[PDB]
Every structure is written in structure tokens, then in C-alpha cells.
Amino acid sequence: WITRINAAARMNGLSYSRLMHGLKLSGIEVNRKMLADLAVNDLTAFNQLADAAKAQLN
Amino acid sequence: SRVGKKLLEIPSDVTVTLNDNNTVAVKGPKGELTRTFHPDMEIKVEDNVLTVARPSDQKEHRALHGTTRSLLGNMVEGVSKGFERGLELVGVGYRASKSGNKLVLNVGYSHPVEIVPEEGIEIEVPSQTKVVVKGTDKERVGAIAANIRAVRSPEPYKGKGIRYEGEVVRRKEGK
Amino acid sequence: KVRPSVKPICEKCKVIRRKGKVMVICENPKHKQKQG
Amino acid sequence: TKGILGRKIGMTQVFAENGDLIPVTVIEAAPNVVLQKKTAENDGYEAIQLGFDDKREKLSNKPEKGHVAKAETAPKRFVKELRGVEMDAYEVGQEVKVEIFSAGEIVDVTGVSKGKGFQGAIKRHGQSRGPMSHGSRYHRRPGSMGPVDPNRVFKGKLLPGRMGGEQITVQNLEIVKVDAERNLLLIKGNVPGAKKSLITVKSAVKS
Amino acid sequence: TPMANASTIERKWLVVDAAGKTLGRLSSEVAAILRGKHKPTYTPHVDTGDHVIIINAEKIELTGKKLTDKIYYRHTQHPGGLKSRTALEMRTNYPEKMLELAIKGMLPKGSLGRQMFKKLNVYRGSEHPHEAQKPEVYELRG
RNA sequence: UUGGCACCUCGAUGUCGGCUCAUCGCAUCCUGGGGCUGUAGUCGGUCCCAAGGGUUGGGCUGUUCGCCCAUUAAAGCGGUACGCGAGCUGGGUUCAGAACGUCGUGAGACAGUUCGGUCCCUAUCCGUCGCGGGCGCAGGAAAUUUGAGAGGAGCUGUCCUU
RNA sequence: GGGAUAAGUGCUGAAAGCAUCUAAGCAUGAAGCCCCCCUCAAGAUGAGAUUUCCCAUUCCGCAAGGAAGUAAGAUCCCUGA
């Protein structure tokens, strides 16, 4: 599922090495890594979490 | 103690363009020469003055600095003067003439040697002894005469075969 | 000649590093050396 | 390069012009018919199929009966290409025969060699027999395969097999005469292939 | 019970132009697409390849001396019968074996490194008969 | 190579040398091509690149090696279980017999010598070299092909003219 | 024979005003390399090619599909080389 984050995180222009920093800051989100994956089954629910990532990437 | 900061003068009439990129096309009475230069060299053409404006200072650039000027300094003054070389046959059963435009040398090999010149190269036959090539490109003319000297390279005992004018062969006392 | 200690002998010898090979070139053709 | 193909018959001796003695083959190769012109505008390369030695209609099939329709002649057994003639001077339907050749044309000749059957290591490769006496049991046999450390036989170690049956070019022959009256070639020397096999008589690769 | 696709996957043809690019940094960018390291429905055993038709096979640069110092090796099973060849012979004669050998070196070998490799095509620039599949142009990430 | 050590094998890994069949590495004997020459031509020394090919018939001894006979463009080294015994020969070492010198009081001993002295195997698998039967190649068929790829060939001596 | 190369041999020219086979640029050069010469060869699953053939049945399964009879051709069987 770490590949299944980069196969979605790079759709929105981020990397897993940066994305999992974003979820650790903006939010203290303890999301399951199969379930921040699953957030792909119903995209763009994942992108709106990736939207939450980029706000503390600035 | 540089070369590419020297200047190239063109009074008349060897005209030079800035045909990009960067195919600097000489003209003139003799002909036209097209040396293609690598894109770091930024030639500034003043009033009858060709120059070199270098991009920067590295050993890549400095070794390419003086050359691109002094290729043109061979080119531009080659469409006014031309260039020529002097071959000097020393030997006994060794002689020279042309036939058609091949250069028939009866060098002491059991078959005569013929040297076909290229376009824009005129290898004169002045006499039995000397042979003169005449053209425009120094990297062609001297290179054609280098294709001639290796017919019979000069042996050190009796200096034989083709030989540039003038040239000092190191001499051995064979006994 | 070919040797790993390429040096000029007389002062008429130049040391010209052609092709990654420290060659010494001179007038007298018994100075003709190379490491290679 | 010109080339025709056909059967041979056998060997003769024909002396000529001197006190000589020439080993001469006899070839049936006339006449060939141009059946199809392979063209590089369609197939990439240039060739001409030639057919030879027409057969009766019981021996020929409807895929191949219609193949001779462009030349409009009888069905015909032996078909092969020839890459690649001077282009063209040929038309599909022109009866190529012996008339090209002469006494002096240097000629390569190809054909399928006389198959001798399953033969052992001496006869198939020129390998050498061991000692026939001195108590030695090793004779007639190929012997040592290879070393020990690679633990295998290297590919190419010669062994018994079926000798023959390949196609062999034999070069630089001299066509002696031309017999368009009898459809007969005459070639100096030995020509590969058994009695009555098919033989392609090219022109050589010279010089 | 996460999701793992099987025979419900749709494949999309691409084009990579290798013109002023190294060997070398695009093979690892074509392999990941052939293997499918960008579709989020990525299940590793199920042939996820949206696949690439390479154009300008005659134009590939590669830095350093490696036209003349990098040498291929295609050894047979015959003793000492290797046929080596420099890259300059392979850039001129046929580079169709240059890239396909590179991608076959990229992929996981087995029965996917055949199936990922059956997906790729290489065409010498710039003509390719794939009008009837319409590949979108994949510009590269660099 | 003579060695050191004793780490695979003493419920067995056959040891010297020949015959066959080779491959491979070049640190090259030639042959191709060159620098230097203390190279006048001739023939060399020496250093460079180069494995494609060739690299002999004996006498002697078990011999590898070695010397010598005569040729040759030359008669290269070296690895591959000092290649190769489920492919062969045992001529020696190292089975018992038998002697000789030497040693021991004696049985006997000796890398000191000599004459004689059962070399087993129906090929399972992988290899190798040939032959077939399926199947596939988006319908079945018959001919001729193209060539990605695989091999084979790759040696040279004289002589006459110039 | 062709084409690129080894060691050479260079023609130009700088950095380092001259010089300098090299760094940009162009050559020549070996029984070496790649072909040409000869053999295999589309099982080359990347299964290529062109030529000429036979045709586009009869029944079931509404359908996907399955059988039975058949053309082009071939095979068994026989005389053999």
C-alpha cells in the first residue's frame, strides 16, 4: 500500500516521503496504511486528505 | 600571451558572415569556407574586425578560446593568399609528373604512385624535382601533402623520396 | 621505448601528455618514450 | 549473376584441343521457366523463382496448378529462387535455358549431397582411429568429451550422426560446352549430389 | 480485504520520445509505467501494464565515453563464442535491441518480465504503425 | 614447480606417462602491422599491437623433461582433478613370487636396482549429436522465402619477373 | 574486396603568443573486429514474408457454444530408392 500511496500521491504531485510527513503535521492522523490506501477506492477522498497535507507543506 | 584576444582584419575582399549557428561562412575571390564552431564561442564582428568574445574562464574554454579565432585566421587569409606547400624529391630513379590530374610519381617501388587530389586542391608539377600542392584549407592542403610524404618516407642514410621544403633529416653514417 | 618511469633525458625533450599517456617527445628519436 | 538449375546424369571424360583429359559432368538443366518475379517493391528483396522438369497432372495440386498461371505452362516440380540477377531482362514466361553460358564462364554450383546414412565418428568428421593392437580396446570411437570442472559436454564436440543430406556449393568450375540441341551442360570436375538429383548451376563470385 | 484487481483492468498506450535523453534515466521511467507504478489499482501479479511505444530510437544520447567503452556481450552456448559489440555499432546498425535489452534488464524476471516486455514496442523514429490505438503523449518527469 | 597448513573427501575423490578429442588464457614461435636500432642492402636484437590460423617425423629411455638425427614460415609456453581409465593402454611406482647390493643377531627392510604380476559396469538424469510424434503461429492448405541469430572457413612455402 | 578500429604515422591548431597527433576537427593503419564466401535457420511465442488454392455447410443450444458430414489438400495400405 506504500506503492498504492505513491500511485495516488503523485497524481496530486507529492511523494510518499513528503506525504507521510504532511499527514503527520497537518492532522496527527493515525490512519491505517491500508486505509489511507483504500482512500483510493473512493477517490477523491484521498486527494482531499492530500489537500490537507499541502497546507502544512507551506 | 593569448591568441584569441588578437584581432582579424579584413580590408578587401574576403567577406565573412554570421550564418547561425554558428556556421561562419567566409567568402572572397578564391572561394568560400564553412567551419562549424561549437556554441560557446560568441564571435563579435566589428568594422572589418572579426573577434572572439569568450563565454567564461575555464580550461575547457581557454583551449577553445584561441582556436576558433585562429581557425578563421587561417580561413580568411586563405581566401586572399591561398596556401601551398613545397615537396622536394631527392633520389636517383625518382621523378615526378602529373597525368590528367593524378600525380604520377615514379618512386623506386616497382609500380608508380598516383595521388588523386580533392576538389579545390591544385597539385602543381613545377619540375622533375619539386611538387607543389595549392589550395585553401590548411587542414586539407598539408594533410594532402602528408598523404604524399608517406609514399617514400625519408630514410636517414640517404634522404630519399618526398620531403618538405625545407626540412632537416637526421643523418646516419651507414658503413 | 615503453616504460613506467617516463622522463626526459636531455633538455631537448618535451613532456606531452597525449591520450591519458604521459609521453615524452624529443628531437633525438631514442628519447621516444611512453607509459602504456 | 546468371543461374539455371536442373538434374545431372553422370560423369564423362572429354579431351579437347590438346592431349588433355577433363573430368566432365552432364547436366539436364534446360529449360527453366520464369514463374514469379520476386520484387523489392513488394517483398523487400529481388529474386526470380525458376521451375524445372514438368510433371504430369496427377502429381500436381490446385494450389500449385494456379501458380503456373502467370507463366501459362504445365505444372513443374522443382522450384527455387535466385538472388539476384541483373534487373531484369526477364519476363514471367520466358524459357531460360543453356544459351547464356560458354567455355569460359567461371561458375559456382550448388546441390543436395549424396546422403550416406548414419555414420560414425571417423567417417563423419575425419576423426582418427585409435590403436588396433597392443591390447587396446579403444578403436573406431570418438573418445574424450571434455574436462571435468565444467561438468558438461561443450556444444560442438563431434559425435556420430546422419552424414549427408545438406546442400553444398562447390565453387569456381568451368562450364565446358553448350548443347542447346540436346539440353546438356558439361562442367569440369565433380559436382555434388547423387545420381539424378537437382543441381543449381549459378555464375560464380569472382575474382 | 483490501482491493486487488483481476481482469477488470484497462490498458492505455503511450509515447516516450527519446531525443535528448540518456538511456538510462528513461528506462527506469518506462519500466515503472510498463509495470504500473503509477496506477493506484496496483496489485503486483496481475499485468497492470499501460504500455509504451518508443519513438526516435535513432536519436538516443548517453553521456560519457560510452559509445565506445560500453560494450554489449551476447555469448552463445558454444565455447568462447561470445560476440561483443560497442554501443556505436548498436546505435547505427540497430538500436531496437538497445532499448529492449535495457527494459528487459529493468523488469522483474520470470513470467512477468515476459509479459511486461510483450507490452513494449520500439520503433525507429518517428514512424510507427499504431494509428489505430491512439497513444497519448507521455512527457517525462525528469 | 618444491613447499607450509590440514579446511571437502580414508562406509574409497584412481595416482605418473602415452593414444584419442580438444577448448581457453595470452606473458608470442611464426604469419600481418609498426617504434627504435650498436638498422648501408641481406639476416638480426629489442619493445609494441594482434589469438584468426598453423603449430612435425624419428632414435633413446616408462618417462614429462632432456640430448641428438633431418626437415621446417615456425617446431611457443601454460590452465582445464599436473584435461581426458563408467573412452583405452599399464611401461614405472606400490600387492603377494623371485633375486642382487646394503643394513639387522633374526623375522625382514630400502624414493637403491631387476624378471613376472585378473584394469569390472546392460547409461537413470543433465549434457552432447542426429532423427521423429504432438501442439502453436486467430480458418484450413501447397510452394518459395526474408534473416534477428547460430556455426564453418580464417595457415602459408617456394619459383620467375620487376 | 567494403566499413569502422589497435600500435603507429599525421595535417591543423590552442590552452602555454612559438612549439604541441588532441584538448574541439579531419585522416591513414593489422592474418585482428564487422560483413562480404559457405552452411543452418520464423518454436524468431517478437511464430515474419509473398504466390496460388478451398470455401464460407448440415443439425442442436433463443444465445455464448457444441457436435455430425465435407471442399482445398493430406494420411493409413501397397511397389520401392
Q: What is the resolution of this structure in A?
A: 3.8
**Residues B13/B29, Cβ–Cβ less than 8 Å:** yes
Q: Compute the distance between CA of residue E25 and CA of residue E102 in angstroms, rounded to an integer.
A: 11
Amino acid identity of E91?
R
Which residue is closest to D156 within chain E, CA to CA?
E78
Contacts of C27 in chain B (CB under 8 A): 170
The three grid cell numbers given for residue D37, joined into one nine-digit string:
518475379
Is nucleic acid strand F under 7 Å from C19's C-beta? Answer: no
Q: Mark which residues 12-31 of A lie under 8 Å from E by CB.
A: none
CA dihedral of A27, A30, A35, A39, whole degrees rounded to 10: 0
User: How was it solved?
Assistant: cryo-EM
CB atoms within 10 A of CB B7: 12
The partner residues of B42 in beta bridges, in order of sequence, read: B53
For helices A16-25 and A45-55, the axis angle rounded to 10 degrees is 80
Query: How far E41 CA sits from the closest chain A CA (Å)?
Result: 7
DSSP label at residue D191: -
DSSP label at residue D170: E
Environment class of B21 (CB within 10 Å of its CB; exposed 0-12, middle 13-18, buried 19+): exposed
- Residue E103 belongs to what H/E stretch? helix E96-106
Q: Compute the distance between CA of residue D3 and CA of residue D202 in angstroms, rounded to an integer.
A: 4
Residue B109, CA distances (Å) to B106, C6, E56 in order: 8, 38, 52
Residue D139, CA distances (Å) to B168, D30, D51, D131, D156 in order: 73, 49, 48, 6, 22
* Residue D198 CA, distance from chain mean position: 6
Residue A3: which of E2, E3, E42 has the nearest Cβ?
A: E42
The three grid cell numbers given for residue B39, joined into one nine-digit string:
556554441
**Which chain D residues 167-206 have CB under 7 A to strand F?**
none
Is nucleic acid strand F under 7 Å from D154's C-beta? Answer: yes
**Residues E85/E67, Cβ–Cβ less than 8 Å:** no
Unique residue bearing C-alpha cell 589550395: B135
Q: Compute the distance between CA of residue D193 and CA of residue D186 in angstroms, rounded to an integer.
A: 16
Query: How far A4 CA sits from the closest chain E CA (Å)?
Result: 5
E4 backbone dihedrals φ, ψ, rounded to 5°? -150, 105
Query: How far D157 CA sits from the closest chain E CA (Å)?
Result: 10
**Residues B30/B4, Cβ–Cβ less than 8 Å:** no
Q: Compute the distance between CA of residue E21 and CA of residue E142 in angstroms, rounded to an integer.
A: 9
Is nucleic acid strand F under 7 Å from C1's C-beta? Answer: yes
β-pairing verdict for D161-163 and D117-119: antiparallel
CB atoms within 10 A of CB D64: 14
Q: Which residues of B60-99 are buried (b: 16+ CB within 10 A; e: fewer)?
A: eeeebbbbbbebbbebbbbbeeebebebbbebeebebebe
Nucleotide nearest C29 (Cα, C1'): F36
Which residue is closest to E79 within chain D, CA to CA?
D154
Q: Which of A34, A39, A41, A35 is nearest to A51 (CA)?
A: A39
Residue E15, CA distances (Å) to A41, E24, E51, E58, E134 in order: 28, 17, 9, 15, 10
Q: Kindly list the partner chains of chain E, i.e. chains with 3 or more CB atom pairs below 8 Å.
A: A, D
- Residue D177 belongs to what H/E stretch? strand D167-179
For helices E96-106 and E27-35, the axis angle rounded to 10 degrees is 60
Which residue is closest to A34 within chain E, CA to CA?
E2
Unique residue bearing C-alpha cell 613532456: C15
Chains A and E in direct contact, meaning 3 or more beta-carbon pairs closer than 8 angstroms: yes
Is the alpha carbon torsion for D26, D30, D36, D40 positive or negative? positive
**Residues D104/D158, Cβ–Cβ less than 8 Å:** no
C-alpha neighbours within 13 Å on the C-beta side of residue E15: 19
Interchain CB distance below 8 Å, E42 and A10? no
Q: Compute the distance between CA of residue D90 and CA of residue D87 in angstroms, rounded to an integer.
A: 8
- Residue B77 belongs to what H/E stretch? none
Size of interface B-C (CB pairs under 8 A): 3
Q: Which residues of B49-59 are buried (b: 16+ CB within 10 A; e: fewer)?
A: ebbbebeeeee
Q: Mark which residues 8-67 of E lie under 8 Å from D by CB.
A: none
| Helical spans, DSSP H, in chain B | 59-75, 138-149
Q: Which of E5, E2, E1, E14 is nearest to E42 (CA)?
A: E5
Is nucleic acid strand F under 7 Å from D161's C-beta? Answer: yes
The three grid cell numbers given for residue B64, joined into one nine-digit string:
577553445
Contacts of E3 in chain A (CB under 8 A): 38, 41
Q: Compute the distance between CA of residue E31 and CA of residue E36 in angstroms, rounded to an integer.
A: 8
Q: Which of B77, C10, D189 is nearest to C32 (CA)?
A: C10
* Residue B31 CA, distance from chain mean position: 15
Which residue is closest to A33 within chain E, CA to CA?
E2
Interchain CB distance below 8 Å, A7 and E2? no
Contacts of B171 in chain C (CB under 8 A): none
Q: How far is the CA of A21 from the C1' of F27 (A)?
A: 62
- E-assigned strands of chain E? 14-17, 52-55, 71-73, 84-86, 121-122, 136-137
Amino acid identity of A31?
N
Contacts of B170 in chain C (CB under 8 A): 27-29
Q: How far is the CA of D73 from the C1' of G29 (A)?
A: 58
Q: Which of C23, C20, C18, C17 is nearest to C8 (CA)?
A: C23
Interchain CB distance below 8 Å, E41 and A40? yes
Amino acid identity of D160?
P
Chains D and E in direct contact, meaning 3 or more beta-carbon pairs closer than 8 angstroms: yes
Q: Compute the distance between CA of residue D129 and CA of residue D122 in angstroms, rounded to an integer.
A: 7
Query: How far C30 CA sits from the closest chain B CA (Å)?
Result: 12
**Which chain D residues 16-75 have CB under 7 A to strand F?**
38, 43-45, 47, 49, 61, 63-64, 67
* Residue D132 CA, distance from chain mean position: 38
The set of strand F positions with any atom below 7 Å of a protein CB reads 18-25, 35-41, 47-49, 52, 80-81, 83-84, 87-90, 126-131, 141-152, 162
